[model samples]
Target chain A: MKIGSGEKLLFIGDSITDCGRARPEGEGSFGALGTGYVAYVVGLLQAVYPELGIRVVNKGISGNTVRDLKARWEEDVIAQKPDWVSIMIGINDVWRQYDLPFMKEKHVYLDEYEATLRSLVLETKPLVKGIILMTPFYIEGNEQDPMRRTMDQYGRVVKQIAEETNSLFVDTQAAFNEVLKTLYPAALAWARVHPSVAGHMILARAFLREIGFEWVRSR
Target chain B: MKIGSGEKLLFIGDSITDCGRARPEGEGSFGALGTGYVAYVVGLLQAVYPELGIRVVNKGISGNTVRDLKARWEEDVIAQKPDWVSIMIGINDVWRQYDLPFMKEKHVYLDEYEATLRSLVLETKPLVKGIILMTPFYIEGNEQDPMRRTMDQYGRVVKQIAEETNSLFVDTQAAFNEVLKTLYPAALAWARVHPSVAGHMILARAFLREIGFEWVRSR
Candidate 1:
């Protein structure tokens, strides 16, 4: 269901999602939700649906893997009692594998990645109204890039989890790819990892649309 | 008293307000409200009070003066039929006086500033529920600086209009000055006139507080 009155929506993920969100809490103070898609999403949800009174929290941490998310899931997610959770992690999961190929202990392979994501969705599905699985994005427009190919493989797994759990899924890469078709890949994000303002908006826009935010002004 | 259903809040002003707002339209597509304080304000308003269904319009144009606002007032403000109006100007007016001392025609002195602001607030006071008069700010922490002093004079005019018209007054200077107490003025903005992200939040926080935002998360 779309955002209605009294839903507590929590967003949890990585540096991409973290964007420097405040610790222990994420909703109050200046840019506490970090200055990324999380902030943009909060802005849109509030601007278009001011009457909903939705409670939004940011639990995204910098350099977090699905492993890291699991480590703190209880404190950051379960303890919060969120009605909805938007999770956009796994990029570093893929990046560590590539960036630190020699550090096998740090890498989260495809099987482990899929398994953890599946478990998180399965566990949270029953706990909350719904879960939103946001695909980890690679700002690189070229699908053939080695890292991009691997990232897409992770995204496919997320889609599978969404299908299995009947949860909403957002392919953030698809949105960025659309922009990449017109603008240079670097124009959207840094090294196809961190995003620019336009990149953040793309992430937020994709999330809002899934929640039925038509990007049109509310009456 | 705060933003309510059927309320159209229109924000109009100088470059700070302009922040690259869409031409001929303000709210649609990518960042139509520009990337400055207006976006932050809209984002926070919606995230906290989604059900209000408040419609926000941005009518800011860069390099605009009180004279320029008067020129476009009918098309931008009146035609929009806003139930609540937020006006922050006089920066360029003060800037013109300082930067282009030779261009006598371009400057808007304190007397003209007070009269134009007074006239605008008086004329629109009856049409909407309330009007918000935001003071033009100087990023410089030292209130004694010539530009800051002049900007404060213009702000005083806005305060008087708010008092006389029974409207809301946002002391944007006080907000910036608070940050200045700890950080250098340059930390708040790059050009000192334009703001950095922190500066934008100070603006947003000040405006939100005036419009009943408590800086606490929505529940």
Candidate 2:
């Protein structure tokens, strides 16, 4: 496994990352990991290599921008003392512009999006052993579309930040892109925001691949 | 649109229907409809008919059995005075028996599950203009597998209840089973309980189909 044995991995991002946890119950892996890609990762980890004993936590919030993450960074990220961190955000950063086009004050402009995300990565890099930056995706193939174009710009920022901080960069869109080759984007995501189960698996698979997910078994 | 103008639709069930929206943030639909089938249903309703004025409410509580639903039904559902109600439950009814085999008191046996669900439907059907019964699913193909078998049995009860009460029945497993023909159940839902976005779409489609979802445009 690329992740070390006994590492504490914390995943933080927007709603897609927040697979519905924050409570003490339900079907997500081990109950509290939230149901998204993070929980699925844990489920695979437990199934494939239970001996590794990696501790994972989900700190995703729906409808949150990078600004929101910075506001809660100290308490949610640093306080937990995670060994590894995964960040996938910027969807709402682009969404608000489309849905509430008139509200310029709420919009997280391009500069703010890049600078804020970069700052968070730089700030958190020192405290953690490793970091994984997952690009926010739109699940569409056409690069020229307005929101998709903007989402790509945000994703590029994530890539640059990952390189700058020497963190692992996971291309979340590549997962959806492969599916987009065969199926329409709407089949995978109706809102072009939230992912379906297959979309989440593609994400989970991407993150797992970066960490050397067990393609072969221990048995 | 399948749903009428000014129609209020209320959705209730266990955690899958709950999709993490029980809390203030993360995992719910349109910020309130938990992220499962309920959110997808609303997303389509809003997109297809933004002016229809159909209000949807989600009352899913994670890890709740039918008995638990009965306890809170009066306040959560009846009080709301919804025009239409959709109920998807029974996963936990079978899950508890498998996971907690020894905790007899905590488990809601098949008899209790069927009777309680029937009573709730019988009680609510008269109050609302329409009620939809959704069968709990196992996300597996092997009809002989223990949990799958028992879950199918529970689904049968739901079908029977709907027929007996003159309510619409949504065979959710039929949705998953169609996909199970090509992919292992995991590809659709890793946990075999919580569905991915696509899985949720299947559910949204199932319900919308029952209500005569418009494949074309508003008349």
lDDT of 1 by residue, B73-119 (tens): 98999888899999999999999988999999999998888888889
Best candidate (score: DockQ)? 1
Tens-place lDDT per residue, model 1, A1-219, is 287788899999999888888987987554678887887776555544445667889998889989999888888999899999999988999999888999999989999989988878877888999899999988787789999999999999998888888999899888777666656665445777987565675677678778877333455
> TM-scores for chain B, in order?
0.96, 0.93
Which of the numbered candidates is closest to the native, going by highest lDDT?
1
lDDT of residue A150 for candidate 1: 96
Residue A24, candidate 1: alpha-carbon lDDT? 78
Interface residue Cα RMSD of candidate 1 after superposition = 11.0
Which digits, one per residue and each the tens of the lDDT, describe model 2 over residues B1-219? 446888988888888887767552223333566556676666555534545667778888889899899998888889889999989889988899999999988889989998999999999988989998999999899999999999999999999999999998899888778667755666556678766555665677677778876633555
How many clashes show up in model 1?
A: 16
Scored against the true structure, residue B35 in model 1 reaches a CA lDDT of 81
Q: How well is candidate 1 docked (DockQ)?
A: 0.05
Q: Each candidate's interface RMSD, rounded to one decimal? A: 11.0, 11.9
